[PDB]
Amino acid sequence: VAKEWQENKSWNAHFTEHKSQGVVVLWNENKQQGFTNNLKRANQAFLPASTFKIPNSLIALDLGVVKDEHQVFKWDGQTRDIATWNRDHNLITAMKYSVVPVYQEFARQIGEARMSKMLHAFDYGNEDISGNVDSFWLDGGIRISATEQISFLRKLYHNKLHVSERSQRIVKQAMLTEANGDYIIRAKTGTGSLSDAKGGKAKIGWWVGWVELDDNVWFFAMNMDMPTSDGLGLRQAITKEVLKQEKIIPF
Amino acid sequence: VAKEWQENKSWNAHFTEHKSQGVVVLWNENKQQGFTNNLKRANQAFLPASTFKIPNSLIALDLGVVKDEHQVFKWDGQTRDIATWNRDHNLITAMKYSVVPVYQEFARQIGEARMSKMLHAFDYGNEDISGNVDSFWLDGGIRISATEQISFLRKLYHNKLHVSERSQRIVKQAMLTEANGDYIIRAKTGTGSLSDAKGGKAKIGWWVGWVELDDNVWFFAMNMDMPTSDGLGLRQAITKEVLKQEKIIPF
Ligand SMILES: [F-]
Numbered sequence A, B: 001v002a003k004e005w006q007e008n009k010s011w012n013a014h015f016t017e018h019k020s021q022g023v024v025v026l027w028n029e030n031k032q033q034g035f036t037n038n039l040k041r042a043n044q045a046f047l048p049a050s051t052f053k054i055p056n057s058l059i060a061l062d063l064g065v066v067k068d069e070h071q072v073f074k075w076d077g078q079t080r081d082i083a084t085w086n087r088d089h090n091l092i093t094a095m096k097y098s099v100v101p102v103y104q105e106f107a108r109q110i111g112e113a114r115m116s117k118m119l120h121a122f123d124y125g126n127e128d129i130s131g132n133v134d135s136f137w138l139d140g141g142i143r144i145s146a147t148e149q150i151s152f153l154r155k156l157y158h159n160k161l162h163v164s165e166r167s168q169r170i171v172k173q174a175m176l177t178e179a180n181g182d183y184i185i186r187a188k189t190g191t192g193s194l195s196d197a198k199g200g201k202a203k204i205g206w207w208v209g210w211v212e213l214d215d216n217v218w219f220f221a222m223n224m225d226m227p228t229s230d231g232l233g234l235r236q237a238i239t240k241e242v243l244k245q246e247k248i249i250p251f
Helices: A010-017 A049-062 A093-097 A100-110 A112-121 A146-157 A165-174 A234-245 B011-016 B049-062 B091-096 B100-110 B111-119 B146-157 B166-174 B233-243
Strands: A004-007 A022-028 A033-036 A175-179 A185-195 A203-212 A215-227 B005-007 B022-028 B033-036 B176-179 B184-195 B199-213 B217-223
Touching: A010 A022, A010 A165, A010 A234, A022 A146, A022 A234, A022 B091, A033 A146, A033 B011, A049 A093, A049 A100, A049 A112, A049 A146, A049 A165, A049 A185, A049 A203, A100 A112, A100 B100, A100 B111, A146 A203, A146 A215, A165 A175, A165 B011, A165 B166, A175 A234, A203 B091, B011 B233, B022 B233, B033 B146, B033 B176, B049 B091, B049 B100, B049 B111, B049 B166, B049 B184, B049 B199, B091 B166, B100 B111, B146 B166, B146 B199, B146 B217, B199 B233
Parallel strands: A004 A033, B005 B033
Antiparallel strands: A022 A033, A022 A215, A175 A185, A175 B176, A185 A203, A203 A215, B022 B033, B022 B217, B176 B184, B184 B199, B199 B217
16 A cells, blocks of 8 residues: 655755756665655656666566577677677677667567567556557657656566566576675666657666665666766766665665 | 696786685686696595585575575574674575575485485585584585586586576575676685694685676686685685686776
8 A cells, every 4th residue: 555755855966966857766675665856757657768678578588589598699680880789699698788679579579469468467667569569668659657667676576577487587687787795786777769748859868676785675766868868877876876875885 | 528627827826925725716618628726626625615505505495495585594593603694594695694504404404315315416526415414514524626616516507407497596696796797706605624633623715606708607616725814805806816817807
Protein backbone atom coordinates (compact mmCIF):
# COMPACT_ATOMS: atom_id res chain seq x y z
CA VAL A 1 0.00 0.00 0.00
CA ALA A 2 1.53 3.43 1.22
CA LYS A 3 5.08 4.24 -0.03
CA GLU A 4 7.61 6.49 1.91
CA TRP A 5 9.31 9.22 -0.15
CA GLN A 6 11.71 11.93 0.72
CA GLU A 7 12.23 14.95 -1.51
CA ASN A 8 15.74 16.42 -1.25
CA LYS A 9 16.00 19.40 -3.62
CA SER A 10 19.68 19.96 -2.61
CA TRP A 11 20.63 17.32 -5.28
CA ASN A 12 19.46 19.89 -7.92
CA ALA A 13 22.84 21.62 -7.45
CA HIS A 14 24.56 18.52 -8.93
CA PHE A 15 22.56 19.11 -12.11
CA THR A 16 22.75 22.98 -12.20
CA GLU A 17 26.58 22.92 -11.69
CA HIS A 18 26.77 20.82 -14.88
CA LYS A 19 24.34 23.26 -16.68
CA SER A 20 21.61 20.58 -16.70
CA GLN A 21 18.18 19.64 -15.36
CA GLY A 22 17.40 16.12 -14.16
CA VAL A 23 16.13 13.65 -11.60
CA VAL A 24 17.84 11.11 -9.39
CA VAL A 25 15.46 8.53 -7.85
CA LEU A 26 16.75 6.16 -5.15
CA TRP A 27 15.02 3.33 -3.39
CA ASN A 28 16.36 1.95 -0.11
CA GLU A 29 15.20 -1.73 -0.23
CA ASN A 30 15.53 -2.51 3.53
CA LYS A 31 13.81 0.60 4.73
CA GLN A 32 11.27 0.64 1.78
CA GLN A 33 11.93 4.38 1.32
CA GLY A 34 12.43 6.42 -1.83
CA PHE A 35 14.53 9.55 -2.19
CA THR A 36 14.43 12.04 -5.03
CA ASN A 37 15.30 15.66 -5.84
CA ASN A 38 12.15 16.05 -7.97
CA LEU A 39 8.90 14.18 -7.22
CA LYS A 40 7.29 15.52 -10.41
CA ARG A 41 10.12 14.53 -12.82
CA ALA A 42 10.60 11.18 -10.91
CA ASN A 43 7.11 10.47 -12.27
CA GLN A 44 7.58 11.87 -15.82
CA ALA A 45 7.66 9.17 -18.51
CA PHE A 46 10.32 9.19 -21.29
CA LEU A 47 11.59 6.90 -24.02
CA PRO A 48 13.72 4.23 -22.23
CA ALA A 49 16.32 4.38 -25.09
CA SER A 50 19.16 1.88 -24.32
CA THR A 51 17.76 1.14 -20.77
CA PHE A 52 15.32 -1.06 -22.84
CA LYS A 53 18.29 -3.47 -23.34
CA ILE A 54 17.31 -4.95 -19.89
CA PRO A 55 13.67 -6.19 -20.82
CA ASN A 56 14.85 -6.81 -24.40
CA SER A 57 17.66 -9.18 -23.16
CA LEU A 58 15.19 -10.86 -20.72
CA ILE A 59 12.60 -11.53 -23.44
CA ALA A 60 15.25 -12.71 -26.01
CA LEU A 61 16.76 -15.16 -23.45
CA ASP A 62 13.35 -16.41 -22.24
CA LEU A 63 12.21 -17.07 -25.84
CA GLY A 64 15.45 -18.84 -26.76
CA VAL A 65 16.41 -16.06 -29.26
CA VAL A 66 19.60 -15.86 -27.09
CA LYS A 67 20.82 -19.28 -25.83
CA ASP A 68 23.25 -17.93 -23.21
CA GLU A 69 25.64 -15.03 -22.43
CA HIS A 70 28.42 -16.58 -24.58
CA GLN A 71 26.45 -17.00 -27.82
CA VAL A 72 28.16 -14.96 -30.55
CA PHE A 73 26.11 -12.45 -32.60
CA LYS A 74 28.37 -11.93 -35.59
CA TRP A 75 28.71 -8.46 -37.10
CA ASP A 76 26.55 -8.16 -40.27
CA GLY A 77 29.49 -6.46 -42.01
CA GLN A 78 27.70 -3.07 -42.18
CA THR A 79 29.90 -0.28 -40.81
CA ARG A 80 27.99 1.71 -38.20
CA ASP A 81 28.94 5.00 -36.44
CA ILE A 82 30.25 3.37 -33.22
CA ALA A 83 33.47 1.34 -33.84
CA THR A 84 32.68 -1.13 -30.99
CA TRP A 85 29.45 -2.06 -32.86
CA ASN A 86 31.38 -3.18 -35.95
CA ARG A 87 32.46 -6.51 -34.42
CA ASP A 88 31.17 -9.81 -33.01
CA HIS A 89 29.38 -9.68 -29.68
CA ASN A 90 27.82 -11.85 -27.04
CA LEU A 91 25.12 -10.65 -24.61
CA ILE A 92 27.74 -9.28 -22.13
CA THR A 93 29.59 -7.15 -24.69
CA ALA A 94 26.36 -6.14 -26.54
CA MET A 95 25.14 -4.69 -23.14
CA LYS A 96 28.56 -3.21 -22.25
CA TYR A 97 28.85 -1.38 -25.62
CA SER A 98 25.12 -0.68 -26.08
CA VAL A 99 25.18 -2.38 -29.50
CA VAL A 100 21.80 -1.25 -30.89
CA PRO A 101 21.92 -3.50 -34.10
CA VAL A 102 22.24 -6.69 -31.94
CA TYR A 103 19.16 -5.63 -29.92
CA GLN A 104 17.20 -4.62 -33.07
CA GLU A 105 17.82 -8.19 -34.38
CA PHE A 106 16.58 -9.67 -31.00
CA ALA A 107 13.43 -7.42 -31.30
CA ARG A 108 12.65 -8.64 -34.83
CA GLN A 109 13.07 -12.30 -33.79
CA ILE A 110 10.87 -11.65 -30.72
CA GLY A 111 8.11 -10.05 -32.83
CA GLU A 112 5.37 -7.53 -32.01
CA ALA A 113 2.94 -10.01 -30.34
CA ARG A 114 5.46 -11.60 -27.91
CA MET A 115 7.19 -8.25 -27.31
CA SER A 116 3.83 -6.62 -26.39
CA LYS A 117 2.72 -9.63 -24.26
CA MET A 118 6.03 -9.63 -22.34
CA LEU A 119 6.01 -5.87 -21.65
CA HIS A 120 2.45 -6.16 -20.32
CA ALA A 121 3.63 -9.19 -18.21
CA PHE A 122 6.53 -7.01 -16.92
CA ASP A 123 4.15 -4.07 -16.29
CA TYR A 124 6.88 -2.06 -18.10
CA GLY A 125 6.17 1.67 -18.29
CA ASN A 126 3.19 2.40 -20.56
CA GLU A 127 3.49 -1.10 -22.23
CA ASP A 128 3.08 0.64 -25.66
CA ILE A 129 5.33 -0.75 -28.48
CA SER A 130 3.88 1.65 -31.18
CA GLY A 131 6.30 2.09 -34.07
CA ASN A 132 8.83 -0.30 -35.61
CA VAL A 133 9.37 -3.55 -33.66
CA ASP A 134 13.16 -2.91 -33.98
CA SER A 135 13.20 0.79 -32.87
CA PHE A 136 10.07 1.60 -30.74
CA TRP A 137 12.34 2.12 -27.65
CA LEU A 138 14.40 4.73 -29.58
CA ASP A 139 11.64 6.46 -31.62
CA GLY A 140 8.26 4.77 -30.90
CA GLY A 141 5.48 4.88 -28.29
CA ILE A 142 7.12 3.21 -25.23
CA ARG A 143 7.38 5.54 -22.21
CA ILE A 144 8.78 4.87 -18.74
CA SER A 145 9.34 7.05 -15.68
CA ALA A 146 12.34 6.84 -13.27
CA THR A 147 10.01 5.45 -10.50
CA GLU A 148 8.60 2.86 -13.01
CA GLN A 149 12.20 1.81 -13.90
CA ILE A 150 12.90 1.22 -10.16
CA SER A 151 9.65 -0.75 -9.97
CA PHE A 152 10.81 -2.95 -12.90
CA LEU A 153 14.39 -3.26 -11.54
CA ARG A 154 13.16 -4.37 -8.10
CA LYS A 155 11.26 -7.26 -9.76
CA LEU A 156 14.38 -8.19 -11.79
CA TYR A 157 16.59 -8.05 -8.64
CA HIS A 158 14.17 -10.40 -6.81
CA ASN A 159 13.72 -12.75 -9.83
CA LYS A 160 10.01 -11.78 -9.75
CA LEU A 161 9.58 -10.99 -13.50
CA HIS A 162 7.44 -13.45 -15.51
CA VAL A 163 10.45 -14.97 -17.33
CA SER A 164 12.71 -17.80 -16.05
CA GLU A 165 15.06 -17.29 -13.07
CA ARG A 166 17.96 -18.11 -15.48
CA SER A 167 17.02 -15.32 -17.92
CA GLN A 168 16.99 -12.93 -14.94
CA ARG A 169 20.37 -14.16 -13.59
CA ILE A 170 21.97 -13.84 -17.07
CA VAL A 171 20.66 -10.26 -17.54
CA LYS A 172 21.87 -9.22 -14.04
CA GLN A 173 25.31 -10.64 -14.92
CA ALA A 174 25.24 -8.68 -18.23
CA MET A 175 24.31 -5.50 -16.20
CA LEU A 176 27.50 -5.76 -14.07
CA THR A 177 29.15 -2.31 -14.33
CA GLU A 178 31.34 -1.94 -11.26
CA ALA A 179 32.42 -3.92 -8.20
CA ASN A 180 34.99 -3.34 -5.46
CA GLY A 181 35.06 -4.40 -1.79
CA ASP A 182 32.39 -1.91 -0.73
CA TYR A 183 29.67 -2.22 -3.38
CA ILE A 184 28.48 -3.73 -6.70
CA ILE A 185 26.77 -1.59 -9.35
CA ARG A 186 24.55 -3.45 -11.87
CA ALA A 187 23.10 -0.84 -14.23
CA LYS A 188 22.50 0.22 -17.88
CA THR A 189 22.72 3.61 -19.63
CA GLY A 190 20.30 5.05 -22.23
CA THR A 191 20.30 8.09 -24.57
CA GLY A 192 17.43 9.08 -26.84
CA SER A 193 15.39 11.98 -28.21
CA LEU A 194 12.45 13.49 -26.33
CA SER A 195 9.38 12.25 -28.18
CA ASP A 196 7.04 12.14 -25.18
CA ALA A 197 6.37 15.91 -25.50
CA LYS A 198 7.31 18.65 -28.04
CA GLY A 199 10.97 19.20 -26.96
CA GLY A 200 12.91 19.12 -30.27
CA LYS A 201 16.69 18.50 -30.61
CA ALA A 202 17.06 17.90 -26.79
CA LYS A 203 18.26 14.49 -25.46
CA ILE A 204 17.36 12.43 -22.35
CA GLY A 205 20.21 10.47 -20.81
CA TRP A 206 19.39 7.70 -18.30
CA TRP A 207 21.27 5.57 -15.80
CA VAL A 208 19.19 2.93 -14.11
CA GLY A 209 20.15 -0.03 -11.94
CA TRP A 210 21.18 -0.71 -8.37
CA VAL A 211 23.96 -0.62 -5.81
CA GLU A 212 24.36 -3.86 -3.83
CA LEU A 213 25.89 -3.47 -0.37
CA ASP A 214 26.62 -6.13 2.28
CA ASP A 215 23.26 -5.59 3.98
CA ASN A 216 21.13 -3.51 1.58
CA VAL A 217 20.26 -2.75 -2.06
CA TRP A 218 19.84 0.81 -3.31
CA PHE A 219 17.93 0.96 -6.54
CA PHE A 220 18.42 4.01 -8.71
CA ALA A 221 16.93 5.46 -11.86
CA MET A 222 18.14 8.80 -13.09
CA ASN A 223 17.61 10.94 -16.14
CA MET A 224 18.91 14.28 -17.24
CA ASP A 225 18.88 16.77 -20.12
CA MET A 226 22.04 16.08 -22.00
CA PRO A 227 24.16 19.09 -22.79
CA THR A 228 25.61 17.25 -25.83
CA SER A 229 24.80 14.07 -27.81
CA ASP A 230 24.78 10.26 -27.30
CA GLY A 231 27.40 10.02 -24.53
CA LEU A 232 27.37 9.46 -20.78
CA GLY A 233 30.16 10.95 -18.71
CA LEU A 234 28.07 13.11 -16.43
CA ARG A 235 25.28 10.70 -15.54
CA GLN A 236 27.40 8.36 -13.46
CA ALA A 237 29.22 11.35 -11.88
CA ILE A 238 25.98 13.11 -10.79
CA THR A 239 24.47 9.76 -9.53
CA LYS A 240 27.69 8.89 -7.66
CA GLU A 241 27.70 12.44 -6.18
CA VAL A 242 24.15 11.80 -4.88
CA LEU A 243 25.10 8.28 -3.55
CA LYS A 244 28.18 9.77 -1.79
CA GLN A 245 26.10 12.74 -0.46
CA GLU A 246 23.55 10.21 0.90
CA LYS A 247 26.40 8.19 2.56
CA ILE A 248 25.47 5.06 0.46
CA ILE A 249 28.84 4.56 -1.31
CA PRO A 250 32.04 5.87 0.40
CA PHE A 251 33.88 9.09 -0.59
CA VAL B 1 45.99 -34.26 -22.34
CA ALA B 2 49.47 -32.56 -22.33
CA LYS B 3 49.40 -29.17 -20.61
CA GLU B 4 51.50 -26.26 -21.97
CA TRP B 5 53.34 -24.23 -19.31
CA GLN B 6 55.75 -21.33 -19.41
CA GLU B 7 57.98 -20.73 -16.40
CA ASN B 8 58.72 -17.06 -15.82
CA LYS B 9 60.96 -16.75 -12.73
CA SER B 10 60.98 -12.92 -13.13
CA TRP B 11 57.67 -12.90 -11.11
CA ASN B 12 59.74 -14.02 -8.08
CA ALA B 13 60.73 -10.32 -7.70
CA HIS B 14 57.02 -9.53 -6.83
CA PHE B 15 57.31 -12.12 -4.04
CA THR B 16 60.80 -11.11 -2.75
CA GLU B 17 59.97 -7.33 -2.86
CA HIS B 18 57.25 -8.10 -0.24
CA LYS B 19 59.64 -10.43 1.78
CA SER B 20 57.62 -13.49 0.69
CA GLN B 21 57.75 -16.78 -1.21
CA GLY B 22 54.97 -18.24 -3.29
CA VAL B 23 53.52 -19.17 -6.63
CA VAL B 24 51.31 -17.42 -9.18
CA VAL B 25 49.70 -19.78 -11.74
CA LEU B 26 47.83 -18.32 -14.74
CA TRP B 27 45.84 -20.02 -17.47
CA ASN B 28 44.93 -18.23 -20.72
CA GLU B 29 41.67 -19.89 -21.77
CA ASN B 30 41.73 -18.93 -25.51
CA LYS B 31 45.30 -19.97 -26.04
CA GLN B 32 45.15 -23.00 -23.64
CA GLN B 33 48.52 -21.96 -22.14
CA GLY B 34 49.78 -21.86 -18.59
CA PHE B 35 52.19 -19.41 -16.94
CA THR B 36 53.93 -19.68 -13.58
CA ASN B 37 57.00 -18.44 -11.68
CA ASN B 38 57.44 -21.88 -10.02
CA LEU B 39 56.49 -25.16 -11.74
CA LYS B 40 57.33 -27.18 -8.60
CA ARG B 41 55.18 -25.11 -6.18
CA ALA B 42 52.39 -24.76 -8.87
CA ASN B 43 51.99 -28.51 -8.32
CA GLN B 44 52.45 -28.62 -4.53
CA ALA B 45 49.21 -29.52 -2.78
CA PHE B 46 48.05 -27.65 0.34
CA LEU B 47 44.93 -27.39 2.49
CA PRO B 48 42.43 -25.28 0.43
CA ALA B 49 41.22 -23.49 3.65
CA SER B 50 38.53 -20.85 2.74
CA THR B 51 39.05 -21.51 -1.05
CA PHE B 52 36.96 -24.65 -0.18
CA LYS B 53 33.92 -22.30 0.20
CA ILE B 54 33.65 -22.60 -3.62
CA PRO B 55 32.96 -26.43 -3.79
CA ASN B 56 31.22 -26.24 -0.38
CA SER B 57 28.77 -23.54 -1.68
CA LEU B 58 28.17 -25.55 -4.89
CA ILE B 59 27.34 -28.77 -2.99
CA ALA B 60 25.15 -26.96 -0.36
CA LEU B 61 23.14 -25.19 -3.14
CA ASP B 62 22.81 -28.34 -5.28
CA LEU B 63 21.56 -30.38 -2.27
CA GLY B 64 19.09 -27.65 -1.20
CA VAL B 65 21.01 -26.94 2.06
CA VAL B 66 21.16 -23.35 0.67
CA LYS B 67 17.96 -22.32 -1.19
CA ASP B 68 19.44 -19.21 -2.87
CA GLU B 69 22.01 -16.40 -2.43
CA HIS B 70 19.52 -14.35 -0.31
CA GLN B 71 18.71 -16.98 2.32
CA VAL B 72 19.76 -15.65 5.73
CA PHE B 73 22.00 -17.81 7.98
CA LYS B 74 21.47 -16.19 11.35
CA TRP B 75 24.34 -15.80 13.79
CA ASP B 76 24.32 -18.65 16.37
CA GLY B 77 24.96 -16.02 19.10
CA GLN B 78 28.49 -17.32 19.86
CA THR B 79 31.08 -14.51 19.72
CA ARG B 80 33.98 -15.52 17.45
CA ASP B 81 37.35 -13.77 16.80
CA ILE B 82 36.30 -12.12 13.48
CA ALA B 83 33.69 -9.35 14.10
CA THR B 84 32.02 -9.84 10.67
CA TRP B 85 31.31 -13.48 11.65
CA ASN B 86 29.21 -12.36 14.65
CA ARG B 87 26.22 -11.40 12.47
CA ASP B 88 23.64 -12.70 9.98
CA HIS B 89 24.82 -13.70 6.54
CA ASN B 90 23.61 -14.87 3.17
CA LEU B 91 25.78 -16.83 0.70
CA ILE B 92 27.26 -13.56 -0.77
CA THR B 93 28.40 -12.13 2.57
CA ALA B 94 29.40 -15.56 3.98
CA MET B 95 31.81 -15.88 0.97
CA LYS B 96 32.93 -12.23 1.12
CA TYR B 97 33.81 -12.56 4.82
CA SER B 98 34.92 -16.29 4.86
CA VAL B 99 32.31 -17.01 7.53
CA VAL B 100 33.70 -20.37 8.62
CA PRO B 101 30.79 -21.24 11.11
CA VAL B 102 28.22 -20.81 8.22
CA TYR B 103 30.20 -23.23 6.01
CA GLN B 104 30.78 -25.70 8.89
CA GLU B 105 26.96 -25.84 9.31
CA PHE B 106 26.55 -26.45 5.50
CA ALA B 107 29.20 -29.28 5.74
CA ARG B 108 27.36 -31.01 8.61
CA GLN B 109 24.05 -30.83 6.70
CA ILE B 110 25.81 -32.14 3.56
CA GLY B 111 27.37 -35.08 5.45
CA GLU B 112 30.49 -37.19 4.81
CA ALA B 113 28.96 -39.48 2.12
CA ARG B 114 27.56 -36.69 -0.15
CA MET B 115 30.58 -34.44 0.54
CA SER B 116 32.97 -37.26 -0.52
CA LYS B 117 30.83 -38.23 -3.57
CA MET B 118 30.67 -34.61 -4.77
CA LEU B 119 34.42 -33.95 -4.37
CA HIS B 120 35.14 -37.12 -6.37
CA ALA B 121 32.54 -35.90 -8.97
CA PHE B 122 34.36 -32.51 -9.05
CA ASP B 123 37.79 -34.26 -9.28
CA TYR B 124 38.73 -31.78 -6.51
CA GLY B 125 42.36 -31.98 -5.40
CA ASN B 126 43.11 -35.27 -3.65
CA GLU B 127 39.31 -35.86 -2.99
CA ASP B 128 40.23 -36.81 0.64
CA ILE B 129 37.81 -35.52 3.34
CA SER B 130 39.71 -37.23 6.26
CA GLY B 131 38.98 -35.52 9.55
CA ASN B 132 35.84 -33.79 10.85
CA VAL B 133 33.12 -33.23 8.22
CA ASP B 134 32.93 -29.58 9.43
CA SER B 135 36.71 -28.78 9.39
CA PHE B 136 38.58 -31.17 7.02
CA TRP B 137 39.39 -28.21 4.69
CA LEU B 138 41.02 -26.31 7.60
CA ASP B 139 42.70 -29.21 9.50
CA GLY B 140 41.91 -32.52 7.71
CA GLY B 141 43.18 -34.57 4.77
CA ILE B 142 42.02 -32.48 1.75
CA ARG B 143 44.93 -31.21 -0.39
CA ILE B 144 44.84 -29.14 -3.58
CA SER B 145 47.54 -27.59 -5.75
CA ALA B 146 47.34 -24.20 -7.58
CA THR B 147 47.14 -26.06 -10.98
CA GLU B 148 44.34 -28.33 -9.60
CA GLN B 149 42.42 -25.20 -8.41
CA ILE B 150 42.64 -23.77 -11.99
CA SER B 151 41.42 -27.13 -13.28
CA PHE B 152 38.40 -26.96 -10.92
CA LEU B 153 37.75 -23.24 -11.65
CA ARG B 154 37.72 -23.82 -15.42
CA LYS B 155 34.92 -26.41 -14.98
CA LEU B 156 32.99 -23.97 -12.75
CA TYR B 157 33.44 -21.11 -15.29
CA HIS B 158 32.08 -23.35 -18.11
CA ASN B 159 29.20 -24.74 -15.98
CA LYS B 160 30.85 -28.20 -16.46
CA LEU B 161 30.76 -29.33 -12.77
CA HIS B 162 28.33 -32.16 -11.95
CA VAL B 163 25.88 -29.84 -10.10
CA SER B 164 23.09 -27.71 -11.62
CA GLU B 165 23.86 -24.68 -13.88
CA ARG B 166 22.00 -22.53 -11.27
CA SER B 167 24.27 -23.67 -8.40
CA GLN B 168 27.26 -22.73 -10.59
CA ARG B 169 25.81 -19.30 -11.55
CA ILE B 170 25.03 -18.53 -7.86
CA VAL B 171 28.58 -19.45 -6.73
CA LYS B 172 30.17 -17.36 -9.53
CA GLN B 173 27.99 -14.41 -8.39
CA ALA B 174 29.14 -15.00 -4.78
CA MET B 175 32.79 -15.00 -6.06
CA LEU B 176 32.44 -11.46 -7.54
CA THR B 177 35.38 -9.45 -6.15
CA GLU B 178 36.03 -6.61 -8.60
CA ALA B 179 34.66 -5.16 -11.83
CA ASN B 180 35.39 -2.02 -13.83
CA GLY B 181 35.17 -1.23 -17.55
CA ASP B 182 38.26 -3.32 -18.41
CA TYR B 183 37.86 -6.56 -16.45
CA ILE B 184 35.90 -8.62 -13.89
CA ILE B 185 37.64 -10.58 -11.12
CA ARG B 186 35.67 -13.50 -9.60
CA ALA B 187 37.87 -15.08 -6.93
CA LYS B 188 38.20 -16.46 -3.40
CA THR B 189 40.92 -16.08 -0.77
CA GLY B 190 41.88 -18.74 1.81
CA THR B 191 44.43 -18.98 4.68
CA GLY B 192 45.56 -22.43 5.72
CA SER B 193 48.00 -23.84 8.27
CA LEU B 194 51.20 -25.74 7.61
CA SER B 195 52.96 -28.06 10.12
CA ASP B 196 56.61 -27.09 10.88
CA ALA B 197 59.33 -29.32 12.46
CA LYS B 198 59.50 -26.88 15.47
CA GLY B 199 55.93 -27.84 16.53
CA GLY B 200 53.98 -24.71 15.55
CA LYS B 201 52.01 -23.60 12.45
CA ALA B 202 53.03 -21.56 9.35
CA LYS B 203 50.30 -19.85 7.23
CA ILE B 204 49.72 -20.35 3.49
CA GLY B 205 47.53 -17.74 1.81
CA TRP B 206 45.59 -18.44 -1.38
CA TRP B 207 43.87 -16.34 -4.01
CA VAL B 208 42.16 -18.33 -6.72
CA GLY B 209 39.70 -17.32 -9.41
CA TRP B 210 39.70 -15.64 -12.80
CA VAL B 211 39.89 -12.40 -14.77
CA GLU B 212 37.13 -12.01 -17.37
CA LEU B 213 38.01 -9.74 -20.31
CA ASP B 214 35.83 -8.91 -23.32
CA ASP B 215 37.30 -11.76 -25.39
CA ASN B 216 39.28 -13.98 -22.97
CA VAL B 217 39.37 -15.47 -19.48
CA TRP B 218 42.56 -15.67 -17.44
CA PHE B 219 42.31 -18.15 -14.63
CA PHE B 220 44.62 -17.74 -11.67
CA ALA B 221 45.53 -19.65 -8.54
CA MET B 222 48.17 -18.31 -6.24
CA ASN B 223 49.54 -19.19 -2.86
CA MET B 224 52.29 -17.73 -0.73
CA ASP B 225 53.99 -18.05 2.67
CA MET B 226 52.21 -15.53 4.88
CA PRO B 227 54.45 -13.03 6.68
CA THR B 228 53.95 -11.06 9.90
CA SER B 229 53.14 -7.85 8.03
CA ASP B 230 49.80 -7.05 6.38
CA GLY B 231 48.35 -10.47 5.72
CA LEU B 232 45.58 -10.67 3.09
CA GLY B 233 46.38 -7.48 1.09
CA LEU B 234 49.63 -8.83 -0.28
CA ARG B 235 48.08 -11.68 -2.18
CA GLN B 236 46.03 -9.48 -4.38
CA ALA B 237 48.86 -6.99 -4.83
CA ILE B 238 51.35 -9.69 -5.96
CA THR B 239 48.75 -11.27 -8.32
CA LYS B 240 47.80 -7.87 -9.77
CA GLU B 241 51.54 -7.05 -10.19
CA VAL B 242 51.87 -10.28 -12.25
CA LEU B 243 48.66 -9.55 -14.28
CA LYS B 244 49.90 -5.98 -15.01
CA GLN B 245 53.43 -7.31 -15.87
CA GLU B 246 51.83 -9.85 -18.27
CA LYS B 247 49.72 -7.03 -19.85
CA ILE B 248 46.46 -8.90 -18.83
CA ILE B 249 45.05 -5.94 -16.88
CA PRO B 250 46.03 -2.24 -17.34
CA PHE B 251 47.94 -0.19 -14.69
F1 LIG C 1 16.68 -15.26 15.82
